[PDB]
Design a protein around this ligand. Sequence first.
Ligand SMILES: O=C(O)CC[C@H](NC(=O)N[C@@H](CCCCn1cc(COCCOCCOCCOCCNc2ccc(N(O)O)cc2N(O)O)nn1)C(=O)O)C(=O)O
Ligand SMILES: O=C(O)CC[C@H](NC(=O)N[C@@H](CCCCn1cc(COCCOCCOCCOCCNc2ccc(N(O)O)cc2N(O)O)nn1)C(=O)O)C(=O)O
Ligand SMILES: *[C@@H]1O[C@H](CO)[C@@H](O[C@@H]2O[C@H](CO)[C@@H](O[C@@H]3O[C@H](CO)[C@@H](O)[C@H](O[C@H]4O[C@H](CO)[C@@H](O)[C@H](O)[C@@H]4O)[C@@H]3O)[C@H](O)[C@H]2NC(C)=O)[C@H](O)[C@H]1NC(C)=O
Ligand SMILES: *[C@@H]1O[C@H](CO)[C@@H](O[C@@H]2O[C@H](CO)[C@@H](O[C@@H]3O[C@H](CO)[C@@H](O)[C@H](O[C@H]4O[C@H](CO)[C@@H](O)[C@H](O)[C@@H]4O)[C@@H]3O)[C@H](O)[C@H]2NC(C)=O)[C@H](O)[C@H]1NC(C)=O
Ligand SMILES: *[C@@H]1O[C@H](CO)[C@@H](O[C@@H]2O[C@H](CO)[C@@H](O)[C@H](O)[C@H]2NC(C)=O)[C@H](O)[C@H]1NC(C)=O
Ligand SMILES: *[C@@H]1O[C@H](CO)[C@@H](O[C@@H]2O[C@H](CO)[C@@H](O)[C@H](O)[C@H]2NC(C)=O)[C@H](O)[C@H]1NC(C)=O
Ligand SMILES: *[C@@H]1O[C@H](CO)[C@@H](O[C@@H]2O[C@H](CO)[C@@H](O)[C@H](O)[C@H]2NC(C)=O)[C@H](O)[C@H]1NC(C)=O
Ligand SMILES: *[C@@H]1O[C@H](CO)[C@@H](O[C@@H]2O[C@H](CO)[C@@H](O)[C@H](O)[C@H]2NC(C)=O)[C@H](O)[C@H]1NC(C)=O
Ligand SMILES: *[C@@H]1O[C@H](CO)[C@@H](O[C@@H]2O[C@H](CO)[C@@H](O)[C@H](O)[C@H]2NC(C)=O)[C@H](O)[C@H]1NC(C)=O
Ligand SMILES: *[C@@H]1O[C@H](CO)[C@@H](O[C@@H]2O[C@H](CO)[C@@H](O)[C@H](O)[C@H]2NC(C)=O)[C@H](O)[C@H]1NC(C)=O
Ligand SMILES: *[C@@H]1O[C@H](CO)[C@@H](O)[C@H](O)[C@H]1NC(C)=O
Ligand SMILES: *[C@@H]1O[C@H](CO)[C@@H](O)[C@H](O)[C@H]1NC(C)=O
Ligand SMILES: *[C@@H]1O[C@H](CO)[C@@H](O)[C@H](O)[C@H]1NC(C)=O
Ligand SMILES: *[C@@H]1O[C@H](CO)[C@@H](O)[C@H](O)[C@H]1NC(C)=O
Ligand SMILES: *[C@@H]1O[C@H](CO)[C@@H](O)[C@H](O)[C@H]1NC(C)=O
Ligand SMILES: *[C@@H]1O[C@H](CO)[C@@H](O)[C@H](O)[C@H]1NC(C)=O
Ligand SMILES: [Ca+2]
Ligand SMILES: [Ca+2]
Ligand SMILES: [Cl-]
Ligand SMILES: [Cl-]
Ligand SMILES: [Zn+2]
Ligand SMILES: [Zn+2]
Ligand SMILES: [Zn+2]
Ligand SMILES: [Zn+2]
Lengths: 694, 694
Amino acid sequence: KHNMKAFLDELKAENIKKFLYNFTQIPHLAGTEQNFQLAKQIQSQWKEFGLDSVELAHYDVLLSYPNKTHPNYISIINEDGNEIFNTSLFEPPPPGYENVSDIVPPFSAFSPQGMPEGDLVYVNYARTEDFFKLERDMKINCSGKIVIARYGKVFRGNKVKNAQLAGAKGVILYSDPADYFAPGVKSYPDGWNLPGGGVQRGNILNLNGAGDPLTPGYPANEYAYRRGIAEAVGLPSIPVHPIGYYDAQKLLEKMGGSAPPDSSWRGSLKVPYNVGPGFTGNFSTQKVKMHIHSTNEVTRIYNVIGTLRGAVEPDRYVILGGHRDSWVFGGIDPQSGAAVVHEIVRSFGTLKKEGWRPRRTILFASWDAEEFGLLGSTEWAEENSRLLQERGVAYINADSSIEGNYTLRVDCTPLMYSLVHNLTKELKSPDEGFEGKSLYESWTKKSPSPEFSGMPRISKLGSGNDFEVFFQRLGIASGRARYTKNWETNKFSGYPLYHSVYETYELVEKFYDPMFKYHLTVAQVRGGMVFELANSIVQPFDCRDYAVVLRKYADKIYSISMKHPQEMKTYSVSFDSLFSAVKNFTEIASKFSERLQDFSNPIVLRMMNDQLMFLERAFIDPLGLPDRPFYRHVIYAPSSHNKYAGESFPGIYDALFDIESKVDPSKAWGEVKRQIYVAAFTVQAAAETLSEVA
Amino acid sequence: KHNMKAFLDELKAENIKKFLYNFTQIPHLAGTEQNFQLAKQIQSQWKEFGLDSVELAHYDVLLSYPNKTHPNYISIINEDGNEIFNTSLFEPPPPGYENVSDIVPPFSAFSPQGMPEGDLVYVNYARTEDFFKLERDMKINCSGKIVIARYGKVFRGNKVKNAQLAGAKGVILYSDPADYFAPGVKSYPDGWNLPGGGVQRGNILNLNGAGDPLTPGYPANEYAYRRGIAEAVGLPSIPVHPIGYYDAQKLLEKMGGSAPPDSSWRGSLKVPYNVGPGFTGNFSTQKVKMHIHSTNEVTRIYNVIGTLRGAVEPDRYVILGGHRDSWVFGGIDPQSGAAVVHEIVRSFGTLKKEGWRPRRTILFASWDAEEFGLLGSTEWAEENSRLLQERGVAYINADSSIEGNYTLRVDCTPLMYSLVHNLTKELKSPDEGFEGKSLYESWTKKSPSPEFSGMPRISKLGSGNDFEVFFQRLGIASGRARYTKNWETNKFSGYPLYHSVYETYELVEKFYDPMFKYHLTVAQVRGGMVFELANSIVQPFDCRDYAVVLRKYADKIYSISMKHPQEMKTYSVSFDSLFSAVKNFTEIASKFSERLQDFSNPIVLRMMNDQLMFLERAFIDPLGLPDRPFYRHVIYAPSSHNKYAGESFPGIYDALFDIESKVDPSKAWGEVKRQIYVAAFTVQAAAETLSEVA
Ligand SMILES: O=C(O)CC[C@H](NC(=O)N[C@@H](CCCCn1cc(COCCOCCOCCOCCNc2ccc(N(O)O)cc2N(O)O)nn1)C(=O)O)C(=O)O
Ligand SMILES: O=C(O)CC[C@H](NC(=O)N[C@@H](CCCCn1cc(COCCOCCOCCOCCNc2ccc(N(O)O)cc2N(O)O)nn1)C(=O)O)C(=O)O
Ligand SMILES: *[C@@H]1O[C@H](CO)[C@@H](O[C@@H]2O[C@H](CO)[C@@H](O[C@@H]3O[C@H](CO)[C@@H](O)[C@H](O[C@H]4O[C@H](CO)[C@@H](O)[C@H](O)[C@@H]4O)[C@@H]3O)[C@H](O)[C@H]2NC(C)=O)[C@H](O)[C@H]1NC(C)=O
Ligand SMILES: *[C@@H]1O[C@H](CO)[C@@H](O[C@@H]2O[C@H](CO)[C@@H](O[C@@H]3O[C@H](CO)[C@@H](O)[C@H](O[C@H]4O[C@H](CO)[C@@H](O)[C@H](O)[C@@H]4O)[C@@H]3O)[C@H](O)[C@H]2NC(C)=O)[C@H](O)[C@H]1NC(C)=O
Ligand SMILES: *[C@@H]1O[C@H](CO)[C@@H](O[C@@H]2O[C@H](CO)[C@@H](O)[C@H](O)[C@H]2NC(C)=O)[C@H](O)[C@H]1NC(C)=O
Ligand SMILES: *[C@@H]1O[C@H](CO)[C@@H](O[C@@H]2O[C@H](CO)[C@@H](O)[C@H](O)[C@H]2NC(C)=O)[C@H](O)[C@H]1NC(C)=O
Ligand SMILES: *[C@@H]1O[C@H](CO)[C@@H](O[C@@H]2O[C@H](CO)[C@@H](O)[C@H](O)[C@H]2NC(C)=O)[C@H](O)[C@H]1NC(C)=O
Ligand SMILES: *[C@@H]1O[C@H](CO)[C@@H](O[C@@H]2O[C@H](CO)[C@@H](O)[C@H](O)[C@H]2NC(C)=O)[C@H](O)[C@H]1NC(C)=O
Ligand SMILES: *[C@@H]1O[C@H](CO)[C@@H](O[C@@H]2O[C@H](CO)[C@@H](O)[C@H](O)[C@H]2NC(C)=O)[C@H](O)[C@H]1NC(C)=O
Ligand SMILES: *[C@@H]1O[C@H](CO)[C@@H](O[C@@H]2O[C@H](CO)[C@@H](O)[C@H](O)[C@H]2NC(C)=O)[C@H](O)[C@H]1NC(C)=O
Ligand SMILES: *[C@@H]1O[C@H](CO)[C@@H](O)[C@H](O)[C@H]1NC(C)=O
Ligand SMILES: *[C@@H]1O[C@H](CO)[C@@H](O)[C@H](O)[C@H]1NC(C)=O
Ligand SMILES: *[C@@H]1O[C@H](CO)[C@@H](O)[C@H](O)[C@H]1NC(C)=O
Ligand SMILES: *[C@@H]1O[C@H](CO)[C@@H](O)[C@H](O)[C@H]1NC(C)=O
Ligand SMILES: *[C@@H]1O[C@H](CO)[C@@H](O)[C@H](O)[C@H]1NC(C)=O
Ligand SMILES: *[C@@H]1O[C@H](CO)[C@@H](O)[C@H](O)[C@H]1NC(C)=O
Ligand SMILES: [Ca+2]
Ligand SMILES: [Ca+2]
Ligand SMILES: [Cl-]
Ligand SMILES: [Cl-]
Ligand SMILES: [Zn+2]
Ligand SMILES: [Zn+2]
Ligand SMILES: [Zn+2]
Ligand SMILES: [Zn+2]
């Protein structure tokens, strides 16, 4: 029998281990020859594995690299202009890799060049509220200062945007042990903590969904017209560079000026965490100088696109995609995900060789240049947008399979909640103590839903990964899943070795998943979701779950507004239309569900499958959200303060945010009312797609 | 047998005559009680006729009306400020209608209020080239002048935009006998010519597809947020008013200043057609004063929406729509079209009562407020955009059925050319001399294609009617057809009595179509197209016809560019990508056509029907054209100089237009290159929707 069980049973932990080792022996930085060779290898293997076609789709996009002969670094300089302390030029390589070449040194991708000198201001995590506190409460002015911010809490691109708008002339990012060193665990290579010489790479763009900075809206193909750099999307205006905590301690230890305003501003280093500006009396004439010489360069990237044609509905696409480019070895990010995709392709291809085909077409993607801003997935989706918006059933992401070893983490559209619950009840838990129990049972026990007893937590999608174009631009139902840490007992951000040279095969094999059982569990969840989405007769989406969350989000945004009762009275601000729309959606979804269950007629089926497929699509507004034309989904967008986090009813949320500070309240509350109208209209319009069609 | 022939045979000229008489006894101005009563009558009759549901869809949109107690008029005033001549306050009503109430007097809808006084400048047709000639060649400055323009050649909204940008402080529009009085025919009531007291009503907005000025992008429903007037879309900034040629002669006869530059500036009145500014010496101190007191007011409008549910594909919609609101009696515009739609509904309902249903759903619409800017169709399409873009097969317009009695006029997407040729070969010609011959034969003989021997002319769609939202915003295959005049022997614009009180039932019955045979022919063409679109197993679109026109349009835009060979060399301006895309489209469409002909499998069929349906959709760019976000079709938009005319490759056309006058040629040619990239990309992306799907 060729059924889900056959597919799942063919997956092997040992295969995932072999692929992970194979993908992580050398760096695979986007735009480099090593990453093109790996693309060709994956293309060849996916053909071997049995896919019907496997092609490379290439684009020429703006990338950023340090200058090999003019290294980036930061100094403390004295009155004479002698550089008395310099930050590191590279992370000490891990054991046995000290001779590997082409390790890109730590840098912030897309930083402009410059050598700004000035007094430091420490800005905590560089969040919107951190700058509010500095400017509004502490009266500290960052204009013309170099700011130093600790990584964590929010996407680093938001930090840089926030510093620029505060008037900073440069930004230094660093990893504080408070956020990247778990108490009681040893630093790499002896444990999974960040050593003081470790540094987190990463881009600092604010693309808001645009893709390649030079070609927003259109693929960066052979004849593309490119914007000039000055008109490019999302580039920072001030130099930026990341450092480790040994180096940070040397920059922070001399800080003077104001004390930190409270303990939430203090990390774990043995320094006062003074905000500045500048250094204490003895060192008041010393300054900090950045030296940044990186260059932005249009560079070719390569996606691998594999097709397994559907037997019945070949014009319906279920997509499993994750990236292949890495900052260095990509032990976790992305190769722990790419190895899982590879084994999934292998298992599907085994069934195919025995004569099976899925009902719908499955597309498999190995994206490039994710690290540089989601570029490979976005340019491909721009090229193929018409095919995707009329044929795209669902997109399942496949980046890092693990960021811990405690329990499952799923973020997805409400339309997949029931599919996920059902699938995980059929899978075995890999957890110690849960031998013989379902993954649903272990997951629900370890990560209970905040709203519902006996169900597990499933979060909204945020951003900062390759599903962004599919979900928030195009409105294709999307999801992602991985193994994660215990959020209760672990106060650090992501995993400590994120985007460092220390993220290696050995990190994973020794410290995260020696048996590869959590990888195998994640392969079962991602692959099982793809299987159901591609094979189920009726698409496995439950519109009623969207109705439940829409009411939760309406209650939430109403509660935010109701902090301003006087203004709601003055400007006649009502949420009645939004609640009405949500009530209507709830009623219409309930009736649709009855018909779906109650309806031999393949036209009524496909009619109904199209209503299911186009339901996520219906939340798209072709005009986009304010000043963010590529965030078109009206229910979900990446937070304007932190690209990693999702925000619900984002247009209304941003219209309300900090509204008590706006100079013209009539205008500001008018725009809140406009966003309520847009949201109520879109919810009602999405509900009406589920009504009888005629 | 229930087939096309049964449907066509049920249509009766005498029924169309009865409905036309019924619809034209009183005025049906948008937003008035009389038009709401007619809406309710049509709703009731369409139910009687057998449709499955018939509902009113209402909206509250910005309309414009004169002030009943403060009439609009124009004066010549002397030095003392005595008004020595006043234009008329109303058109003399036609015989037997001199007691009809609620005839709206002539006005320009959406004019602001004002009483500007000044010297006249005569600006011919107020076209872009007319202003070029005045400013650039004749050195005449319109700043602070009142301009007088003759109607004709281009949409009146473009005239007003052109005058505003020239700095005019008011615009007077008038009907010249050169453009509205056919030699050798008598004035109404004794013939079909415009009398000297006749005046053409009409709106002067520049909405560029927006719909209601206050709610661009969203339906003007019960909770809509409205822009303030100052931010409304498309309103004119200077007062405007229309007059007849008796009154125009009194304003023009005294004109001095420069002579007309050549004969193309001279109409047929016994005046010199001097350009001005101002009057000749004796009258140099006299001035012209407008008095405009109209008000814009949010007003409820009502569309009637009838549904005939499909038997097999109920979630596929074929729409027959035309408007119901009229300026006065609407003898031709729109009731000659509305009577045809009414008889079509009646005939389809006869078949339905005998147990027939079409394969696909047919929607019938009686739109409101077309005269005020396409408002009813646009607001409904905004409300239902998600349903229309995933389910809309085709839209057939149904405004005026006749504008002459000579031959057929069809404007449509290339996807309908073959359907139209085929249908007209099966219909009888109503023309004298062609008894017993096909409509195809009479039409082809009278209106030969400029490109192909033995085929008839079919034009691109322009705008200024209710298909605009469906075709240029949403990308639904659209068409229109009517009987027209002999363009060779007739130099006048449209028909002479257009938008005057003289457009009555008697005009049609006495002078255009006493037997109602041309109406019946038009009912057969419009109804037959709907029938085929809704019943054919394979949608009746031929993608190959799009390939042929795309090459024609590419040749045309390349030829425009090649007038500037030096600049194409300097800035490396190549059309190679656009020709490549067109070649690819031609090849892929040919292969698709083979499969379509070569393919018992309803999924392959529907897959293929969806590829046919989504092909027009693929030409939409979600980012819109520059500064015109609601014109999204990349192949066709209304001309930026004349909303009635269509332009092909409009983004490239407007980038090239008058480019030799741009101050920064590097920038200007850069934007030409950008538009070539967008067009080549969109043509290739549309071609790829016809490739095998996996
Ligand atoms: O250019 C781009 O867009 C991205 C390129 C690249 N992409 C990337 O590296 N992506 C990695 C990013 C890892 C980021 C790690 N990180 C996050 C942060 C800051 O967090 C930001 C806010 O996160 C949004 C989630 O908000 C809470 C939702 O919770 C989801 C998990 N659920 C959960 C919640 C509560 C609890 N508790 O406390 O019981 C438990 C859970 N569990 O899951 O168990 N700092 N570092 C990835 O794997 O997607 C990059 O970011 O540089
Ligand atoms: O707000 C709005 O957008 C519109 C509201 C309202 N809408 C409306 O009244 N619509 C009427 C409009 C009638 C307009 C009459 N008109 C046109 C003009 C100016 O012409 C503008 C350019 O017309 C575009 C067509 O360009 C040529 C395409 O040819 C189509 C006919 N084909 C043709 C061509 C050549 C020949 N020859 O010479 O052999 C023959 C033909 N035939 O058809 O035989 N002035 N008045 C309608 O029925 O659609 C309005 O305009 O006020
Ligand atoms: C949720 O679904 C319900 C349908 O069950 C839908 O209800 C609709 O509500 C609108 C109001 O937003 C109703 O609109 C009314 O329509 C009648 C004609 O049918 C008009 O006469 C009413 O207008 C008068 O009253 C207004 C309010 O006092 C005045 O402002 C106005 O000047 C008029 O005097 C009004 O337009 C509509 O009838 C129902 N439709 C039904 C019941 O089928 C509701 O809108 C949906 N929610 C959302 C957010 O879409
Ligand atoms: C019409 O359809 C045809 C397919 O039949 C399609 O042809 C494609 O053309 C592009 C060029 O625009 C080809 O792109 C090449 O791809 C190869 C790899 O396959 C690259 O190595 C090439 O790049 C090199 O050469 C360039 C030009 O000199 C350099 O600029 C560059 O630096 C590299 O040195 C190049 O990218 C593509 O291979 C074909 N695809 C085929 C034949 O299948 C054509 O693009 C379609 N037209 C449109 C407008 O889409
Ligand atoms: C990763 O695995 C691939 C596939 O086995 C290896 O590539 C093969 O290498 C052998 C020996 O050089 C060649 O004969 C094959 O042609 C290669 N196959 C391909 C590229 O599809 C590759 O060597 C492995 N890489 C590492 C680092 O172990
Ligand atoms: C930090 O690095 C800088 C740059 O290499 C060092 O300064 C240079 O020192 C050399 C040798 O003394 C001089 O010839 C260069 O002119 C200096 N360049 C600059 C820009 O100052 C500096 O010595 C290093 N500081 C420490 C503490 O190692
Ligand atoms: C998840 O599984 C549940 C339980 O099997 C499914 O719900 C059942 O669906 C069947 C088939 O339509 C119904 O007859 C039952 O009444 C449903 N039981 C319920 C709601 O308790 C559910 O559809 C599955 N969800 C998917 C596949 O997305
Ligand atoms: C247009 O035709 C309609 C339909 O026949 C007429 O409306 C009917 O009028 C009679 C007599 O008043 C009523 O008893 C019916 O109830 C009406 N039916 C409707 C509105 O559906 C209307 O009188 C005619 N108008 C003109 C000007 O002739
Ligand atoms: C044109 O119309 C205007 C406005 O009605 C006439 O001017 C008015 O004449 C009356 C009676 O003589 C005066 O009391 C008003 O004060 C005048 N109003 C204005 C604005 O001038 C004018 O007589 C008419 N001209 C002609 C030739 O008929
Ligand atoms: C218009 O009619 C022509 C002639 O009947 C149709 O073209 C034929 O279509 C049949 C059925 O597929 C083919 O087998 C013939 O070879 C075609 N003849 C040709 C192209 O000369 C054409 O499809 C009709 N167009 C429509 C219905 O849109
Ligand atoms: C890198 O720095 C070197 C050495 O100073 C310089 O010659 C070269 O131009 C730089 N390279 C780039 C790509 O800017
Ligand atoms: C911050 O500093 C600069 C002066 O260098 C000034 O232009 C800016 O307005 C200041 N803002 C304050 C004090 O809020
Ligand atoms: C693996 O699980 C154990 C047991 O909870 C834990 O102590 C260890 O820290 C985990 N490893 C990682 C990398 O989280
Ligand atoms: C119309 O004009 C009258 C009479 O001068 C005036 O009283 C009234 O306000 C005007 N009506 C509107 C709607 O402006
Ligand atoms: C037209 O007239 C006004 C002066 O009233 C002036 O502002 C404008 O620049 C003039 N333009 C010319 C002469 O081109
Ligand atoms: C009807 O046709 C005749 C014959 O060509 C023509 O003389 C007459 O002008 C036509 N009527 C109209 C309104 O065009
Ligand atoms: Ca792009
Ligand atoms: Ca609107
Ligand atoms: Cl992921
Ligand atoms: Cl029409
Ligand atoms: Zn990643
Ligand atoms: Zn990453
Ligand atoms: Zn009309
Ligand atoms: Zn009209």
